[PDB]
Amino acid sequence: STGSATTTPIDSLDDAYITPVQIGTPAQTLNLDFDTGSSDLWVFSSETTASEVDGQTIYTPSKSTTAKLLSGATWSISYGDGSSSSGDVYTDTVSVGGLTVTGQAVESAKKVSSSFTEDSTIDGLLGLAFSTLNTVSPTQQKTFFDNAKASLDSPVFTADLGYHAPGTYNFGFIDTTAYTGSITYTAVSTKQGFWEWTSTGYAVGSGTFKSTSIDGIADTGTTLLYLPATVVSAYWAQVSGAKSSSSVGGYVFPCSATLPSFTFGVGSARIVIPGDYIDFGPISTGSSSCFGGIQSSAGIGINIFGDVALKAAFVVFNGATTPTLGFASK
Template sequence: MAVVRAPLCFLLFVLVILYPLAIAFHLPHENPQGPAAHRGKFSNIARRSVTLDLKRNPNYNPNGPAEYARALRKWGAEVPQQLVHSLAAMGDPGGKTGEVDAESIKNDREYLSRVGFGTPLQWLNMDLDTGSADVWVYSTETQPEVAKYHTLWKMEESSTAKKVENGSWMITYGDGSAAWGNIYHDTVSLASITIPNATVESALSAAPPLAGDPDLDGIFGLSYGLPSLTTPPQQTLLSALLPHLESPLFTVDLHHHSSHKPSSYTFGTIPASHHTGHAPLHYTRLIPQAQYWQFAYRGIHVEGQEEWYINPLFNAIADTGTTLMLLSRPTAELYYGSVPGAWRNYTLGGIWTFPCSGYKLPDFEIGLVADIGGVEEAVIAVPGRYMNYSAFTDGTGTCMGGLQEWGYDEFGIFGDVFLKAVYAVFDVGAARIGFAQKVLEPEV
């Protein structure tokens, strides 16, 4: 990773110098899912905005090694063999092949999002995932060994369900695991918004890393411009949703270990009541030809250090479907170098761990690139307490960090560990993403 050491006060200067380059390489481009794609087609559709409050699973018990393996698989990175063997020894489906035995892992989905399918509506718990584009569910077609752990979509009980003849879909992950099945068109409901003839993918089966989460009934993809993985090609649900919205955007407001304030997604508007505090929204354009919510950032800083680390090539995907932050080894070493007693556990494939008590974790800060117009310093801080993802249950008093490394230098994944610290705006129409530092829950 090519980095430049710079004093903290130098960040603004660097952003100013780099800003013309950022604009040069982030020219506006028309989004095939944006307003222009629908101009004049849906003038008779009532446009509105809705908020989905996410119910937090009260039984949520994070499994750090399993989440790390899941994140690596999702993004096509190699899962270390030591981690695979350790998960298999723990009885986790992520370490197995073949059909899943979900009895071995329970309650590992933090947020439950209720989405309605069919006529009359059937309500399923979905993962609203900005890192994928397809909407797929477990159904009465799913193989019994997998289906018995999930609430199923019963297409035969929906008067509006129509099968796409000779249609199929398959999602394959980096380790070769997959889900696959048939394609239907049916009604999908997000609160008061009803989308007719939406593409719903019915799973015939799913490999253990996908099916091993009994709290989850399917994936609801919200990726920026990624096409669906269907044959023949089908319209993504996000594209079908846009004509129903007041504005072509949605917001994400996740909360850390919070029971008094629900996390939420809002579609079609930016609610003033949800944008707490006085921190402004900082927008940055997506990279050219983006399919994911992928944007550039320019620097990182660890609380207590005098210097920023600047790299004009830094970029990351904001992914609600990944729990952790995945960044380069030098970045992880930079952060955990400031944590006394931190070490890489090679028994678990090199996971970064540290003593659970005796030291306050430092904040992790990211320097954002401005969108258009005047350049100002934009820094988002992830509190140190958010960087402690989970504690091991082996009695050693060891914890696992929410920032973990992978094999890409400049490219990273900003998952829920980051998103819980911000109010995020996913602006489809303007091809940009916005973040605001929000008022966070007090440490308990």
């Protein structure tokens, strides 16, 4: 089997991407944030504290003839951005782009943190990291991909995120029309539960390539590119007037600037992030100070190849017995 679904930016800045997901019988379609940096599929629901729901579409398990309470199971998750959610668990039928999993754990939120409430466009998350990170207790549950894997034509999914435009998540096949040149594959460590890999270096604009190993995670659920402070300083030094602002919470730059590109290495291959992808717009409405899309990972504890990086590539998440990651230009 295979599946193919369009993913759409939630706003004009590509702050996140939502993908429609069918849950239950009859189908209830919710728009979920596909997140390769976590491993829970959780949704706003009829069980979510009423004051914490503000415009989201909810899953109502009592209206699904295939929903079953997973007795005694609870979940609770906290993300790197400080947000969180928790609740109980149902199993139900879940379909993405024509690919169906029966008996998928659907984690129903009883509580969500304010950032979730405040984002009316995201109805929940669909985790695509390794199932070892799943938070369900006392019986850990599998991700949608892990459940689907054996049925797929090939044990892979691909992320093809757009810049200020829709893109595609495919399951079970590689669309050879969706990228240019060849796909370069690179090793993955699953030791921390992530799609963790090592970039071979970077360049800023038309500058020379610096060969240096940068360990990080491919994370569709993180907006920006978080890299070591040395790398990030070298980038922003090429933008007149750019500075790190403790009050704003990272590097800002004059909105009048033209940003240089940023290149990252994948083995001997190179992925170029155009400068415009690094612009996240005014820090506040009407401001001439703009927020940068490349930020320091210092104090996160891990480097994160988030959407800023991934949307410059066609990315293969290869879930073979020994997982790997592939990157192509597009």
